């Protein structure tokens, strides 16, 4: 069977704090 | 490999690979630490 991921599986991506930004 | 072998010789090689990334450090230099400051300019240094 399949079914649909939607916005699962973001993970940060490096060990670093960030706040109120948007990081590419 | 045999005693009589210059470039036909053994090497013993060790490579050291640093995990140079921002979790927290465990390897460190013989640098001792000072006392913390606050509230004041410092020319400081944390983990390197
Ligand atoms: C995803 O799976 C559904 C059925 O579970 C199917 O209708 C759809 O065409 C599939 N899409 C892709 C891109 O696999």
Redesign the interface.
């Known amino acids: 069977a399949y079914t649909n991921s939607f916005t699962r599986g973001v993970y940060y991506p490096?060990?670093?704090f960030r706040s109120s930004v948007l990081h590419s | 490999f045999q005693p009589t072998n210059v470039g036909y010789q053994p090497y013993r090689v060790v490579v050291l690979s640093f995990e140079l990334?921002?979790?927290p450090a465990t390897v460190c230099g013989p640098k001792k630490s000072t006392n913390l400051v606050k509230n004041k300019c410092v020319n400081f240094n944390f983990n390197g």
């Open positions: 490096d060990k670093v | 990334l921002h979790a």
